[PDB]
Specification:
Chain A: This is Formate--tetrahydrofolate ligase. Chain A: Keywords: ATP-binding, Ligase, Nucleotide-binding, One-carbon metabolism. The structure is a homodimer. Chain A has 19 helices and 26 strands.
Chain lengths: 555, 552
Amino acid sequence: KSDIEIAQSVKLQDIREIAAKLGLTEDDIDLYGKYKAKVDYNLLNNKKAKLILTTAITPTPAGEGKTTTTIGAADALTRLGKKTIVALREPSLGPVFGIKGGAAGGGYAQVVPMEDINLHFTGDIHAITAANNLLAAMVDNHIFQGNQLNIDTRRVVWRRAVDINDRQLRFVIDGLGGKANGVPREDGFDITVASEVMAIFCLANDIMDLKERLAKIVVAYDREGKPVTAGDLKAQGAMAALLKDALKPNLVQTLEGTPAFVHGGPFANIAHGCNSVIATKMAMHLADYVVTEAGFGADLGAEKFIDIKCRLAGLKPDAVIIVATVRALKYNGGLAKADLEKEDLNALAKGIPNLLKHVENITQVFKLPAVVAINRFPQDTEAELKLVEDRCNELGVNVALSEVWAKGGEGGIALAEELIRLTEDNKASNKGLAYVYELDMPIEEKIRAISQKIYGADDVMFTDKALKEIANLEKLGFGKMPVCIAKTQYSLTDDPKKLGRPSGFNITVRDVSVSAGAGFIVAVTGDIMKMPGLPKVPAAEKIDVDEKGVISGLF
Amino acid sequence: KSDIEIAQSVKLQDIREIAAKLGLTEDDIDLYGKYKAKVDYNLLNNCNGKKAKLILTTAITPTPAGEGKTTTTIGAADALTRLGKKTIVALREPSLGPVFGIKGGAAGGGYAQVVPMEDINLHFTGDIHAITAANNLLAAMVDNHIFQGNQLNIDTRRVVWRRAVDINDRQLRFVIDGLGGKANGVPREDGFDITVASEVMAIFCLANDIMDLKERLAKIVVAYDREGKPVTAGDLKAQGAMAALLKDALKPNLVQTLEGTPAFVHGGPFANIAHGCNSVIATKMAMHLADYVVTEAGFGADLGAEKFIDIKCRLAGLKPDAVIIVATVRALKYNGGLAKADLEKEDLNALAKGIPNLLKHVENITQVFKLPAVVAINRFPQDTEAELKLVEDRCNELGVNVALSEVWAKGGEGGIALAEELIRLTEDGLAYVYELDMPIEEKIRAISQKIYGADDVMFTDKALKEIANLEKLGFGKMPVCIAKTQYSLTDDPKKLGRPSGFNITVRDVSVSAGAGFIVAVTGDIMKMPGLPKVPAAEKIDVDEKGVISGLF
Ligand SMILES: [K+]
Ligand SMILES: [K+]
Ligand SMILES: [K+]
Ligand SMILES: [K+]
């Protein structure tokens, strides 16, 4: 019984009745069909919820069902009589046509309508694409019309975008055709959700902060090295006007009718891998418990959820879910696929340190309440689960068995109860929030602080190129903001083949740039794909529509 | 009072009420906010009309300062509604591009508007994004096929498909893509057009339903192989996915006039390289849901009206019941040589030198297309009683009445005389300029001689060769779409008046095999406008509440 079969076999509730559960009326929402609606963001200036973060262990090529657990947890809280909202990211449209689409969640833990969310949804990503490309066209128009700001054509760092998996646009030359048609320069397209516009869209408090952030975008450098901004080009009003409706969070729902926001969807390497701040804040204003998540494992996603999103937005998670599976741990202990359906306590024993490292980071470094969610598969023996529970309990952390894939909200009551226990009226902590690094430190000491404390690196090495880039960013006033580290998700090191809990290793930063409007430094550790390619046989080939307009072949 | 202020000062009816006027339940429509809806296209095949009376709004040869064809189009519909006739106005959705370069504008004007005006000028219901995505998906699939082995044996230098963005971006007119070594694609020359110039928009507009959409896309010629044979979107298995991307967009957008007349706004191709009409599915939907439908075509009757009949009506199987030809006194005086500025003071000489242009359009409609015509004049206050009488007198001598229209100032009240005449014209086989079985040259000669009044048509040696390749490849039974300047009946924009003793020169001929017509270019054709020195974008702004200002 497919995710698509499951999603189609369930009568969804009209979105006005889902909105009713949040005390929203016809006047608070803009409908986009029967099962989708945008919530006016002006509600946010007239108490707040407990915030739960769903993160996970180091990911495998397949998955650990993080998003599925994130949905399942919210459905469970709802059943226990808690007014709850699950907040998630919108997937980009590109992959749907290359390597198949997929569910928001899975099993009986989904957010729906599945088909619309995968396609145009409410048009957020299209608005973001238009804004990015307007900016680019305004940069080139300015150069063409006389280049008053003295932009060095070879130093425009702003890139164009489309939400299609198109390798042909990674490296291009545009502005050709003689003097009436542009001025030649090297350029390229990123997949829309990699644009700084998407990261900014997700870190904005409101429409005004969006506009002020957009204005700070560095689009190019002039001929003596000084940054030129979207503000210099007077683009920020037009971009924000283009993003006016998009920035209203999208209200949809779970298979059990828990209210749900789907909004924003940045990269989790070159950006912070979270859904939008405005949506998270909206959920906390309308509910008593909010469940959300961040991309990849807890070394990237949660680190950036806390040290970037929470920091700049002024939020604090009240508890963290660390998702794990017996399979993924045994893979981390070096068992190799196809050999993972059999019980192996030795292999599991060698995989647990990874989980423990992530639990240690959440409980000791970030100092947050935590529960471990094992997504129970059928072949998970009684001993294997007991083993995970014992090792976790020795750090003082509980394990909840999650069966939400198979049973929906009923399969995550134990997790939900633990989360209620963990967050029990004890907010306390006038302290504030524990971050990995402080803002006033130099860029290399933040990268070092993250690499050592979170990844468990001995140290971080820097190339001469990286070092020079850091120096010039310190000068230009960018030395006092969060640092986003772009590395592989499949390992705690920057070498993806190093599984388990690696030690006696370093990270190596090869490139450092600023997302000035987003408000963070991006530190790349090698190669980061910004535009995926279509396979030999794209999924598009088998996507069809019939006489009556029903789409087939997306899943 | 400005157009946006009027559009923001009128209290609009919930679109569900508007839908009810047409007998549509909750149920039959997808709401996009309180004042917009998409109507399900499965209501077509549904049952059986009982088709409406179809009214085509066209115009004289345009000047830079427009003649308000759209406003008259909206007003004739509002008038008809006030005369108790169940009416829908059908219009084109405008592209986003120009709004950020030279500021947007009303859908119509004055008290003859379709609204919400802001939404229509931005993302609306997202139709143009779906189109852009479909076009750009196909382009990605063409390149992927080449990158992955190139079974179809495409010549990389003969990929004629082009990418799309709805931004006025001259930087993308001419590009090289597929650079960065073997891992990043295959080098070729390429470029973007503005989205609404893509064949996907023309096909979007000519499709009868979702199955006709899919089958038209399959026939898109994306490239040629190394031995001259066309490769298609169908060969790439792209048509299903393109249609999936366009599944919702293809449902017509139901909105309203200021007075609450049901309006469709849907589709919007060029009127030079394409046919300049709103979508067939929206017109057909309107003719199904109503008794009168008022719609329009881009530019003057030599371009828009010619193609509305010879391309849209031919392929869609429609027949207009009457034609409105819009003109103004100022426009005619301009066309009779009077050089701007003075287009304010009376000048019965210059008017009499402009009128022939009008009479040529009237002749083409009433004698060549053999259709009931009415000339509607958008009366300005500075128009003298004698100027207006001279236009009426010259028109009455050909058998055509003149209705004074003041729908700009007075709304539907100002189009009563026009509407009453339309009722009279529609109470008291379609004639095409050419037959499909004629060769391409002869079809181009037919339009040029009968409609523009040219002596003959000249072709370059390149055009003759291109034409011949299309004849042999089996594209010779298709309608022909002549792309040329709108500001003149010739292909020289300077030639105002009713020019005599001229020829047209066809310099380039290609095919939109999906859309089903040949495009014949006669001069420079700008498919991607650029931004001015100071883009309108610079003064567009949004406040903490999320109100946009500076858009108009
Ligand atoms: K999507
Ligand atoms: K560049
Ligand atoms: K538009
Ligand atoms: K080309």
